[PDB]
Ligand binder design. Structure first.
Ligand SMILES: NC(=[NH2+])NCCC[C@H](N)C(=O)O
Ligand SMILES: [Cl-]
Lengths: 394, 393
């Protein structure tokens, strides 16, 4: 009856939220392995509290430091280091679910290893579907793995869909289950009400407005929503007709689904990742998450805007890239990482982010079976091109 | 494949919405019988268009006029009259579903007959659960009938609940399916922002701002009180599991709060074809002739907390709910009389609650129910309400 978990990415906020849910439900969930790619100090404190069978650092030098610490703080925890070790804890025979919350391309291989092992995948890595969506959906079908999305918007959509679609992510025909379209919602970022002409003079200070700066700039360009759009396409097998973006500045509603009869289902809640995580752990049942019920006294007004592509050119690029396929979305994601770093380094203007993305995307896709290796190679090629366009713009 | 329907109450707006959905889906639904009260002109036009096997008027004189009209225009339609005939078309062997949209206490007996026949019941009669909830839920269990609520709020709640609950209405333990509570929403009516002191002087013109009884009930929030009582019986909700929220714009139709912090809400254009369509198609979905919700034109959504100084009727309904069938039957009956008196300008708007309150107290100080015995109680309560209306006048 007990569900056994490996947590990939235990020292971040997703890891923390996952552990809070497990803390509320000690009779249902048990932590077999914890793994991290940063923060040995946090990791040793978590291994002390959780005493897991395995603890893994992605970096081998960091694993050595952890092993020395846990010789005192968690003597029965076996510490391991490296990429092979991440795959090892992700594929253990006794493990039922894997929280895949290591970010970036470093998360692909261990997430993929869990997929090939037929595990239940609590998906909190954007790159798996942005870079290699077709590949991931195929491997999931091949092994019988269950995919359950962690991210707020995707999780909300998941909850607003019928059970037949929930059980068969990536392979169901939406129109045959009565779905007209999915409404992906977003706040619109700090420049939601800013005149388009003023965007040229925007500074990194303004674009940050609390989480990491790359994620904040993506929120300002709505590239964050673009990437979510791409993931939604693969998660829910949605065509461009079936997938819409709506700006909802207050973020109380997390996303919605429009049905054929006129009915709309929406998911709402307090802004706490423990809620969506809790469902990924408990599906199809539900568990206490340590999150209070929504307080309609404090919600204030809910409003909606149509995104303007003059304001959010990156969003148009992501939608376009989406339906061109893996090569285009890998290219766009790579280019954007370079373009954002250049804006933050004050080499290019805020509005140049979209121009860099647009140039690189056009160059790559005018040319004519994919693997994780070949797509990483393409990621690298796109970065090189983006570096060159950054110089043109500087 | 084809679902066969009897429509009780075909000439009203619910009947019209049902027929619009059937019109969109001729490969899935077929009309076996249509039934109505005494709008013979609308009924003959519908029997012309639909050519059903049976057509029934509740009034026998009206049935005779219809029978003469249809003898050429709908030659294959057998016309019948009276209460027994309503029960007959509601219980036909070939019929799968019954739209129970005859309103008031007259709807109880034929709706109940459909229930005892084990039919799928598309419930659009408030009285079945307000007056005789215990009795209906028991009879539904006994026969294996499916109950699917037509009314907007209940239908919304139904859609926001898990599938395991949807398949067992009136008998599922909500907490065991992860539900903390149901959030029954309402507009708050035309006086949502009005000072309590000003309610004494409101006139029927102001209370109407859609039949007039339903509008006044919307102004007092008795509408929400009645819906509260029905929800309790439909979803088997305890006093912890059922809440009321004011949402003035009525875009959100109701919501459900789950154990993990997640809330599901149902929204849509204000068109009864949507909820009706789901009652017909469940667990699948069908085209309903309703456009998708346009979020560019929705405007702002807000929420308020009801005040019992502003909505005394809502407190009465909740109170009556947990006192049982006798109390809810009494309150409903009293309120029908009290609203008619307000509309006739015999009593003040704020006297509606006072009449309801007096009658409810009088009846429940005194001490196996049937439809007959509860109808008698309905009549006794009306008599008392008439007397309190004179005191107030
Ligand atoms: N977190 C990191 N940047 N790790 C890089 C180190 C790679 C690791 N030592 C290995 O050989 O598998
Ligand atoms: Cl967002």
């Amino acid at each position: 009856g007990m569900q056994k978990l490996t947590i990939l990415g235990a020292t971040g906020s997703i890891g923390a939220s996952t552990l809070k849910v497990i803390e509320q439900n000690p009779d249902k969930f048990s932590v077999v392995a914890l793994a991290a790619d940063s923060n040995v100090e946090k990791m040793q404190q978590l291994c002390q509290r959780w005493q897991p069978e395995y603890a893994v650092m992605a970096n081998k030098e960091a694993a050595l430091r952890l092993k020395m610490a846990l010789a005192v703080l968690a003597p029965n925890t076996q510490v391991l280091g490296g990429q092979e070790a991440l795959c090892y804890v992700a594929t253990l025979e006794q493990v039922d679910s894997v929280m895949a919350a290591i970010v970036g391309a470093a998360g692909l291989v261990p997430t993929m290893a869990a997929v090939k092992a037929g595990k239940r995948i609590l998906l909190a890595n954007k790159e798996a579907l942005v870079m290699s969506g077709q590949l991931f959906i195929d491997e999931v079908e091949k092994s019988g793995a269950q995919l359950l999305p962690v991210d707020s918007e995707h999780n909300a959509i998941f909850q607003c869909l019928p059970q037949t679609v929930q059980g068969n992510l990536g392979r169901c025909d939406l129109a045959s289950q009565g779905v007209s379209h999915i409404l992906l919602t977003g706040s619109g970022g700090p420049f939601r009400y800013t005149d388009v002409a003023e965007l040229e003079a925007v500074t990194p200070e303004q674009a940050i407005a609390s989480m990491g700066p790359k994620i904040s700039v993506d929120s300002a360009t709505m590239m964050n929503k673009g990437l979510e759009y791409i993931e939604a396409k693969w998660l829910f097998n949605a065509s461009r007709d079936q997938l819409k973006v709506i700006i909802h500045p207050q973020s109380v509603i997390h996303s919605m689904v429009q049905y054929l009869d006129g009915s709309v289902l929406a998911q709402m809640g307090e802004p706490d990742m423990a809620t969506p995580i809790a469902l990924t752990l408990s599906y199809p049942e539900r568990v206490k998450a340590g999150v209070k019920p929504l307080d309609f006294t404090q919600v204030g007004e809910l409003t909606f805007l149509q995104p303007d592509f003059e304001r959010y050119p990156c969003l148009a690029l992501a939608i376009e890239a989406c339906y061109l396929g893996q090569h285009a979305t890998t290219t766009l994601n790579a280019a954007n990482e370079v373009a954002v770093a250049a804006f933050l380094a004050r080499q290019i203007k805020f509005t140049d982010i979209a121009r860099v993305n647009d140039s690189v995307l056009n160059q790559v896709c005018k040319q004519s079976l994919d693997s994780l290796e070949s797509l990483l190679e393409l990621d690298r090629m796109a970065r090189t091109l983006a570096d060159e366009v950054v110089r043109e713009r500087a």
